[PDB]
Every structure is written in structure tokens, then in C-alpha cells.
Amino acid sequence: APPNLTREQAEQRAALLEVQSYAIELDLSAGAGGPEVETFGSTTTVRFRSATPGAESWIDLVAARVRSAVLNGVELDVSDYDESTGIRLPELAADNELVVHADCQYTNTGEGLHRFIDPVDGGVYLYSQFETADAKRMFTCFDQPDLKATYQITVTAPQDWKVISNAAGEVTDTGEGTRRHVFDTTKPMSTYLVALVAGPYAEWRDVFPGDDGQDEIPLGIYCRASLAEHLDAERLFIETKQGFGFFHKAFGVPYPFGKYDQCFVPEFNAGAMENAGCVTFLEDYVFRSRVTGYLYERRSETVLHEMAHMWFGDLVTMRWWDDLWLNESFATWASVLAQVGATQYTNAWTTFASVEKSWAYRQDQLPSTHPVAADIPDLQAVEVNFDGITYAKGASVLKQLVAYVGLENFLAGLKVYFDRHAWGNATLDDLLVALEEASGRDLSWWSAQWLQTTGLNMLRPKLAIDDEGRFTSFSVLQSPARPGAGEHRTHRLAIGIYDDDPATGELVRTHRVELDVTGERTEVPDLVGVHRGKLVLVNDDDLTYCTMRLDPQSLATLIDRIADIQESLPRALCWSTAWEMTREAELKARDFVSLVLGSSPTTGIGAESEIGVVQRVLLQTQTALASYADPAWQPEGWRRFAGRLLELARAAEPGSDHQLAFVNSLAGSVLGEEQISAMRGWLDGTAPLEGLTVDTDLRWGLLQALVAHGAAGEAEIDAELERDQTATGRRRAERARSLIPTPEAKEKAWQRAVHDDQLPNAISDAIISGFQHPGQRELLASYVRRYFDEIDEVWHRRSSERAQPTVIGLFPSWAVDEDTVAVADRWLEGEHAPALRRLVSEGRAGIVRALAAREFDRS
Ligand SMILES: [Zn+2]
């Protein structure tokens, strides 16, 4: 039970102490032994200064036992030691020295010095993970980011093992089964950035050739042995080299640490870690299969994300953890800049927009949303106060800060900031000021608008044109931020005009204006007299964080010309804007489906190069068919859609994501005779779609589609169960059982689902998962009113954790009716648990929204 350091405790210790250097010795000789090994030898010698001689302080440590601890000559009383209390340090001198001999535990969790035995070759692999505060599990330290120091690490290793750390080292053979690894003293670092990576790791090497004031850099890659066959080292070294050439130009600071080693470590909890000069990666980035291009891009971004930290995080580190959002956010942004600037992934801002940004917007519109910047009063707070929104929205708003300051200014203040604060600590405000100095902007209000609030502002353009089509006036209307306080933020955004390219007839940008948008209305005089083209795009370049609307004329053009938009970022914004206008009843549902389907499989989404956007659009199109479309037009809608899914898939590249995407969409769609015919053929080899590999997942999905339409019965599911029985498989089979279209099958599920008292929680969700379908609306009418009637008693019956998914999942979002809305209010009358009402409220709103759009579609 390690200590929950508080912001105050850290501030007080930071006030009093200044740490100079750490000397660490570790006995890892017993490490290559078997599971009975539980401890290792950690001897820490720390030199530090105190500015109130005679005061009492404390140093952090988490160990099995403490052999001895000797402050300034005196042997200290370790009899009472507990990890939650560390080591009190009374009678401090002005200059102190502490030596501590202890025995630390290896771990099997993510934290501290983690230990793993490869079940295949029996070899033992060690790695460390110290963020936020696990450094104390290896050595004695003041474990808080603002007491930086240099480290001199020496390890005694089994002789088969390599030992990688922050700095480069030298090895001398001990000839007793071991080797001794002495690593250079490092430059100053925080405790959680210290690395130790020890084992029989496969090892490559390469070097980034030095240039432009940047010295050469020794690079290496490591991974377990078994995994070494699948390591594309060549590729990784090219992407590492692209990054090092980019970042020192951009930042104006050469790589601060000596070499750059990157290790792929087993059982890694956190994906990647930016230990200085020793970056760690989870094993999923070692591609063991023919792998999709999105995975390469994602991996490329991840490598770049950690490399960025060398400067921002490792060279200048925060003071306390409430700047953790800024640290990761900046890195996220820097790595998309690098990808676009120096890698093959020149479409990176598009990916960012459809993946991280879209996700941020989705989260930020729910009632769960919270601001980026949270108060972090103690260490435990970090884990609960910063979540995905923090990071997804953090990156997106830092991108807008870059736009507002201006990129060249921003990069210019980065240099001031890295030089001003290098090998030291720094706050948000320390960086806002550097940026004020570089650009003359006033950012005193910025955090209060963007980091401390929630919700999105809408931007709608207000325009007028003359007989010639040239703007006579152009204003941007900003709406209050919702959900939230309702403030109007300040944006730097661009506006782009798109017109036919005479040579190709494709929509290309013919004009671009940038401006500060402020308050509830902003004028755009740079557009007066400019021809309005065919498409007017506010928030072009996706520089700001908002909800955008298209004018009526641009909207009409889009329906018939979206695939002709030459660039992917503008084309992705319109896919986004069209869906948001469908959600809000400004784009008729039927007209969104027409946007999506296009004239041909070569127009609309059939033409979208971007896999992320295709997936989202396909998913959103289904949602528009099931809920926003009008019942009269809906039967046709589904046929048109499943018709197009089928052609799109029978046209896509063979192992392509796009081909897979069209299959998976067809799977969840409502099908006609041919669709079922072809799909049935795909599970069999009767008529395989070429290149379409059918794994269990896809096979199960295809069957779930077959079974859901009556084309496949219980027997068909049952045999697939013989083909595969797994924890995942039972669930997958259970979902199929629930989908069969018969009241008896549904009746079984409601009771089994709602009422399986003794059913595993895995299975409950899988029983509900298949309980709904776009095409069984008639088959579910009974459960509309009964869910409301029943839920009360299950809420009182089941636990908090179990009950909420059942209410959310079985909420009758399939019945979009005034009747069902009326029933929601009817249920709403009786007093019920606030948490139960909390769900019915979210749930009811979805039905209401769907009904207003159902209506606009009729309009
Ligand atoms: Zn990060």
C-alpha cells in the first residue's frame, strides 16, 4: 500500500529540498531464476541539499525490507518502516547524503520493475514502468516530478541478459554467471522517466546520421526472442529517422539525450512510455500478420508521440500532475505535425479529425462530459480525473491554440520555452507566456474558455450575395457552448471557398481567409466582393473545435457532389457536418442517405479513400435508416443501402479494409434476397468473395446476419459452436441465439436476459446485444412498455454495475414513436431512483431527437 502523495506534500518537499544526483545499484542476479524469485537488491545513494538545516523531510521507498539507511553518517531507525510512510529524514543538514540498502519486489502488474517469463523459451524478461509514482519500487527517491536529478545506474545481470537504460553503458564480465552493466550518469530527469529494460532481448541497431547541429544518434530496437521473427526493424528505423530529422528543425533544439532505444516489452499496461532514451512499447505493435495500413499509421503516430516527449515532457517536465493533460496533448499534436511533415502519412490531419476529434466531440456532447483541466489534489486523483476525453479533447483544443498563436509563432515560443526551461520544470502558464512573447497574443483568458469549460460552440455563416454571386456580406454566428455554461469562445479559423476545377471539374479550393472569431457575430470583410463558389466551408483546415453548419446552397451541392471534393480533410469535414445536420433536423434523413449512396458505387461513400470516415459514415447511415428516416420511405431506404453495400464490397480491393468494412456493414444491415444469397455464399465456399478472409469473428457476424433474417436456424448456429468454442465464442453464439426472429426466441431472451440471475455478466450483455436489430421492429413492440414496467424492479434487484447496462441496452430505442415517448413520461411520473431516472432521461432524449428528425424527413 504505497503512499498517496498530495499536491501540498510535494510542494512542501520541493520547497525545502533540491536533489543533485542518484547512484543506484541493483542486484538482478537471481532474476533469471524461476517464479519463486520475488525480490532484488536496490542500493540508493542520494545527494541532496536542504535550505532549512535541522528540518525533517522524507524519502519514498516501497520494498520487502530495508536493510539499512544512513543519513549523513547517522544510521536511521528503520524498524518501523512501512511503504506508505517511507523513510523519515530528520536532522537535515544543509548538504546531505543518503545511502539505503534494501530489497525490492519484482512485479507482475504494470508498475515498478515488472517481471515476465516467456512460456515458450523459459527466458526471463524485465522492464520498468514508473509513471505516475512507481519509481520508488526500484530505488529510494523523492518520487515527484519537480525534484529532478541525474542518475548513475549499475546493474548486476545474468550473463545472457541485455540491460538497456536511459543512458549508454559498459559491461564487464564477472565470470560468476553474471555481467556488470555500468551506465553513464544521465542528464537531469524526473524519477518516473528512469528506465531499466533487462533480459535476453532480440536486438537491432542503427544510427541517425548527424545534421544541422544535431549530433549523430545511436538507435536500437529490442523485443522478446520469440517475437523477433515478426519485427520489421527496417521500417521502424526509417520512421524513427524521419522523426529525428523533423523535430530538431521544428523545435530548434537537438535531441537532448544521448541515444534512442525503443523496446517492445511483454505485458505492457499502457501502450507506450516516454522514458528518456528508453521508450517502451506494448507488443501489439510488433505485427505478427499481414497487417492493414491504418495499423502502420497508428504505429507511426505512436512512435512519433513518444519521440516528441524527449523534448516536451522529458527535457522540460511539468511541476505537478495537473499538467498531465498538456503533456500528452502536445505530444499528440506534435506527432500528427511530424507525420504530415516527414512521413508517408500526409493525410494525418484527416485521421485526426475523424478519429480523435470526432471522438472528442461525441464525448463532449454527452451529459457525462467534463473539462480538460481537472484539479489534481493527490496522486490517486490522476487516475480518476483524467480520462479519454481529457486527451482527445486536449489535443483538439491545443491544435486550436496553435492556430490562434499561429504556427510559426508557436514553434518559435517552443524554442524560447525549451531553452528557457530545459532540464527543469514548467507550468501551463510558463508556456502560455513564452507564446505571448512569441506572438503578442493575450492568453490570460484562454484556459478559462477552453480548458475549464465543456461543450461545443456552433458556427453558422450568415451570407448574402449579389446578382453575380459575389458576397455582399458574410458573418459567422457563434452559438453558446453546449452542453455547459453557454459561453462564446474565441477562435482562429479559416474559411474556404470551393469551385469546379476547370480541368477536372472537381471541387478544389479557390479561396481561403483566416480570422479571429469572437462573440456572437463576427464579420468577414475579406469575403465581400468574392465569388461564393459552390461550397462555403467555415472551420476549413479543422483549426478549431466546434460544430459547423453549411449554408443552404452549399448543402444542396454536397448531396450530389461530395465525392468530387479533391482534398480529404475538407471532404471529411462535410461528411461530419452533414451527419450533425441530420441529427439536428437540418438535413433530411433521406437526403443524407442520398449523400452517402451517391449516383454510383464510384460516388458518395463508394469513393471515399479514408477508412475511418467510411466506417463512421456507414455506421451513421444505418442509424439514419433505423431512426431518422420516415417509415414510409424506410423500406426502400434499406434496400437501396444493402444494394449499394453489396456492390461496394464486390468492387473493393481483395484484403482491403474497405472490402471488410462493406462486409461488416452489410452484416448489420437489413437485407434483401440477393444480399442474403451472397452472404450465405460467403460463409460457405459456394461463391467466396475474393480476398475476403473469413475468420471466426466475420463468420460469426455473417451467421448472425443469416440467423437474424430466418435464413439460418438454431441448428446452423449450433454447428458453428462446434467449430469454435471459446469464452468469446459462447458470447458470439449467445448473441446469435437472441437474434432469431420469433416472439418465443425473444421471450426467452427477455427473461433469460433480464432475469438470468445466475447468468455470467459476459453472457447477459451478449443476450441483449443480439436482442435488437434494425429489421425486427414488429417483433419487439411488446417489450416497449414492458421494459418500463419491469425496469423498476430490476433496478431495486440488481447492483449498480449490473443494472445500468441492462437498462441502457434494453431501452427501447428501437421504437421511435410518440406512444413510446408518452410511455416514458408515464413511467416518469412515479418517484424512482435518481440513477434510474438518469438513464431513462438520456434514453428518452434520443427518442425525442429521432422523432423530430423523423418529422423533418417527412417535411
Ligand atoms: Zn503522451
UniProtKB/TrEMBL annotation:
Chain residues that bind Zn(2+): 274, 305, 309, 328
Superkingdom of source: Bacteria
Similarity comment: Belongs to the peptidase M1 family.
Keywords: Aminopeptidase, Calcium, Hydrolase, Metal-binding, Metalloprotease, Protease, Zinc
Entry's Gene Ontology BP terms: peptide catabolic process; proteolysis
Peptidase M1 membrane alanine aminopeptidase domain boundaries: 240-450
InterPro entries named among the record's database cross-references: Aminopeptidase_N-like_N, Aminopeptidase_N-like_N_sf, ERAP1-like_C_dom, Pept_M1_aminopeptidase, Peptidase_M1, Peptidase_M1_aminopeptidases, Peptidase_M1_dom, Peptidase_M4/M1_CTD_sf
Recorded GO MF terms: alanyl aminopeptidase activity; metalloaminopeptidase activity; peptide binding; zinc ion binding
Required cofactor names: Zn(2+)
Catalytically driven reaction(s): Release of an N-terminal amino acid, Xaa-|-Yaa- from a peptide, amide or arylamide. Xaa is preferably Ala, but may be most amino acids including Pro (slow action). When a terminal hydrophobic residue is followed by a prolyl residue, the two may be released as an intact Xaa-Pro dipeptide
Pfam families reported in the protein's UniProt record: ERAP1_C, Peptidase_M1, Peptidase_M1_N
Organism: Saccharopolyspora erythraea (strain ATCC 11635 / DSM 40517 / JCM 4748 / NBRC 13426 / NCIMB 8594 / NRRL 2338)
Binding site for Ca(2+): 131
Residue ranges of every copy of the ERAP1-like C-terminal domain listed in the record: 535-847
EC number from the UniProt entry: 3.4.11.2
Protein name: Aminopeptidase N
Domain Aminopeptidase N-like N-terminal: 103-193
SUPFAM superfamilies: Leukotriene A4 hydrolase N-terminal domain (SSF63737), Metalloproteases ('zincins'), catalytic domain (SSF55486)
Any one GO CC term of the record: extracellular space
